[PDB]
Amino acid sequence: RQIKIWFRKWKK
Prior knowledge:
This protein is mainly α. Helices cover about 35% and strands about 0% of the residues. It is found in: Nucleus.
């Protein structure tokens, strides 16, 4: 749900 570190790795 945070999708912030993720958005920082791939391109969520």
